Amino acid sequence: AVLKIISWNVNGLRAVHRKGFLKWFMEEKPDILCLQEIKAAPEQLPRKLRHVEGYRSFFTPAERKGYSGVAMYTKVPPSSLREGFGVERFDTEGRIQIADFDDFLLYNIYFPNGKMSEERLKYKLEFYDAFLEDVNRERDSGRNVIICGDFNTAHREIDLARPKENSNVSGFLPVERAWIDKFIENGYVDTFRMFNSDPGQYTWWSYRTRARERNVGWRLDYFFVNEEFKGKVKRSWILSDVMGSDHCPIGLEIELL
Amino acid sequence: VLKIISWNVNGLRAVHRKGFLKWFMEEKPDILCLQEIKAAPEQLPRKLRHVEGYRSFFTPAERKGYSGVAMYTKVPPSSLREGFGVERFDTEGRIQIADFDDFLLYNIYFPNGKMSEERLKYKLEFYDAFLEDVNRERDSGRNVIICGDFNTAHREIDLARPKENSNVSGFLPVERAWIDKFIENGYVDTFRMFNSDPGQYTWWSYRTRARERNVGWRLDYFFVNEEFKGKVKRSWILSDVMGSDHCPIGLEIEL
DNA sequence: CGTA
Ligand SMILES: [Mg+2]
Ligand SMILES: [Mg+2]
Numbered sequence: 206a207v208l209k210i211i212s213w214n215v216n217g218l219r220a221v222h223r224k225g226f227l228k229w230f231m232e233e234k235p236d237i238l239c240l241q242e243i244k245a246a247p248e249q250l251p252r253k254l255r256h257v258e259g260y261r262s263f264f265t266p267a268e269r270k271g272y273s274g275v276a277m278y279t280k281v282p283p284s285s286l287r288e289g290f291g292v293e294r295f296d297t298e299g300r301i302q303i304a305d306f307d308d309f310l311l312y313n314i315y316f317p318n319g320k321m322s323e324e325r326l327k328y329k330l331e332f333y334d335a336f337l338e339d340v341n342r343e344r345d346s347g348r349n350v351i352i353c354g355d356f357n358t359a360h361r362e363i364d365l366a367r368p369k370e371n372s373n374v375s376g377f378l379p380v381e382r383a384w385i386d387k388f389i390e391n392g393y394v395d396t397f398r399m400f401n402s403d404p405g406q407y408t409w410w411s412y413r414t415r416a417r418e419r420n421v422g423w424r425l426d427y428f429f430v431n432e433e434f435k436g437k438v439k440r441s442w443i444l445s446d447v448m449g450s451d452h453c454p455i456g457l458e459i460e461l462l
Numbered sequence: 463v464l465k466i467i468s469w470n471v472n473g474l475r476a477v478h479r480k481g482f483l484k485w486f487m488e489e490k491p492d493i494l495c496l497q498e499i500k501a502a503p504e505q506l507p508r509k510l511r512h513v514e515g516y517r518s519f520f521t522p523a524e525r526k527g528y529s530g531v532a533m534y535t536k537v538p539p540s541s542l543r544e545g546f547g548v549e550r551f552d553t554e555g556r557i558q559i560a561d562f563d564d565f566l567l568y569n570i571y572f573p574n575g576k577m578s579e580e581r582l583k584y585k586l587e588f589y590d591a592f593l594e595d596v597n598r599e600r601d602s603g604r605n606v607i608i609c610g611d612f613n614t615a616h617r618e619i620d621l622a623r624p625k626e627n628s629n630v631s632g633f634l635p636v637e638r639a640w641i642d643k644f645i646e647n648g649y650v651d652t653f654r655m656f657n658s659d660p661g662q663y664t665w666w667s668y669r670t671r672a673r674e675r676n677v678g679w680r681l682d683y684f685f686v687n688e689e690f691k692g693k694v695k696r697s698w699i700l701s702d703v704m705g706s707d708h709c710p711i712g713l714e715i716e717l
Numbered sequence: 718c719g720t721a
Contacts, residue, residue: 216718412718413626451718576720623719630720670719677719 208281208459211235211444212313212353212426214409214452218243218276222254224449230257233444235456236280237306239313241355243274243299267299274299275315275354281306290339295332303339308461309434310343312336314354319375326375329357333384341391349434351459352393355409355452356427360385360395363404364424376423388429396428396441396457408443409452428457437461463695464715468609468682470497470571470665470708474532478510480705486513492536493562497571497611497708499530499555523555530555531569531610537562546591556588559595564717565605565690568596572613575631582631585613589640597647600687607715608649608685611708616641616651619660620680632679644685652684652697652713664699665708684713693717 211233215221218240230238238260247255247264255262260278265288267273285305289296300315314336319326344350358381362368371377389395397406407422416422428441440458447453467489471477474496486494494516503511503520511518517538523529533542539560545552558569570592575582600606614637618624627633645651653662663678672678684697693716700710 626718627720632720667719667721669721672719675719679720 206460208237208461209235210237210239210351210353210457211454212239212428213454214241214315214355214426214450216242216450216452218254219245219250221449222251226449227253227257229447237311238278239353240276241313241315243276244271245274246270263302265299265302268297272299273315275302275313277302277304277313279304290335292335295335309349309351312340312350312352314352316355316357318357319381330380330384337388337391344392344431350431351457352429353427353455353457355425356385357425358382358385359423359425366407366421376425392432393429394432394435396430396438397443397455399435399438400441406443408455412451426452426455428455464492466493466495466567466607466609466713467491467700467710468495468684469710470611470682470706472498472706472708473500474506474510475501477705482705483510485703493567494534495567495569495609496532499532500527501530502526519558521555521558524553528555529571531558531571533558533560533569546595548591551588551591565607566599568606568608570608570610572611574613586636586640593644593647600648605690606687607713609683609713611682612641613681614638614641615679615681622663622677632681648688649685650688650691652686652694653699653711655691655694656697662699664711668707682708682711684711
């Protein structure tokens with residue numbers, strides 16, 4: 206019947222761990238948990254963090270130490286786990302997990318931040334290209350798909366507090382926002398906007414200006430589903446009172462047979 | 463050529479676990495000035511109080527494990543004063559005023575205002591009491607060296623993140639203006655008369671590689687009265703010494 | 718991400 210999925214950029218898993226991540230996790234009780242920015246060598250993580258009771262866990266670390274990484278905890282045996290799009294440039298930064306849960310594929314993606322370089326804005330845009338290709342291929346083969354994670358782009362003006370101030374800042378460039386339009390036009394739905402059309406709804410806030418108190422944030426974290434599957438979506442929400450990282454978690458609930 | 467070193471040590475027992483004792487003989491100043499001793503000096507090692515070649519002087523706070531200043535000297539002063547004659551300022555282990563005849567040395571751990579409005583207010587009034595003190599000594603004709611942790615970076619050049627910190631104590635317009643007012647009473651920031659570059663810092667946050675990335679503040683200073691500035695040979699930041707969140711700073715004077 |  207009901208399956209709950211949570212996505213969370215954790216800005217460091219052992220950092221969030223010292224702040225009581227496990228207490229939060231055991232309280233929230235997702236059936237599947239997607240995490241971005243683990244940043245730790247998974248094989249030397251606390252055992253109580255790798256083996257949480259009732260879950261199987263999967264870590265996909267970057268090649269660079271202390272950088273990126275994603276993880277998934279699941280109560281549902283996956284029938285398959287893939288950790289890349291099959292393009293080495295993109296598959297080495299610890300950004301990709303694709304799990305087969307029979308009814309749907311689950312993509313847990315840490316999409317690149319394009320602020321550091323002109324070439325990281327390029328890397329980002331090309332990761333975007335490669336992701337759309339991958340998901341489209343799986344979808345066109347008859348698979349339902351759920352994509353969650355940190356897209357690193359606010360879509361519409363509704364999705365950041367200062368839209369006009371950032372129109373030349375990565376995360377809100379016309380190029381970036383245009384790809385999300387294109388992504389959607391390929392048959393995918395922004396699930397939060399299926400149920401909530403309000404401004405103010407953010408998932409990231411700068412640590413400075415102490416922006417979170419002020420609610421001066423960006424919606425950088427999304428659950429997307431393919432159109433064909435959108436009737437199984439019952440809930441899509443932001444867990445805005447969950448602290449510990451510069452991102453808050455997002456939740457999805459699907460009703461399934 | 464007399465060399466003075468000023469170092470906020472974030473605890474004298476914590477830094478003792480690094481070979482501060484080995485640094486201190488591996489780098490032998492005429493006068494060593496230490497801020498934030500954080501310890502009952504009678505429960506400090508015999509070898510930590512009584513160093514060979516040095517008379518040591520500890521000015522501890524009333525509060526346990528808090529604040530405190532120390533001075534190690536080859537030539538002992540003729541007097542040591544430990545307060546401005548203002549009670550709430552004189553009980554926090556913040557003040558050493560040593561008469562070396564040829565000059566007075568102020569070894570001051572200035573309050574930090576970051577924790578509350580009351581402590582910011584306290585830091586600012588401490589700023590006033592000190593200025594009155596040093597103005598009075600300077601007016602009696604004395605040559606004055608003032609060293610230690612001011613807990614304020616004066617100008618944007620003196621910290622890595624001026625913009626996000628302009629509402630943080632350590633970089634308020636009220637704190638920066640007092641450094642203006644102090645200098646304009648006829649006192650000289652010694653470092654800035656030899657080095658005018660950015661990225662010159664004495665403190666770095668422990669949190670987030672800060673030092674290894676050089677995100678720091680210049681919070682430690684050597685100041686002299688205007689008249690006396692002619693005798694300052696060198697003023698430098700000992701950027702590479704470790705074991706505290708502050709690094710040492712150095713002064714070489716001629717006579 | 719470094720200001721605690
Ligand atoms: Mg991050
Ligand atoms: Mg300290």
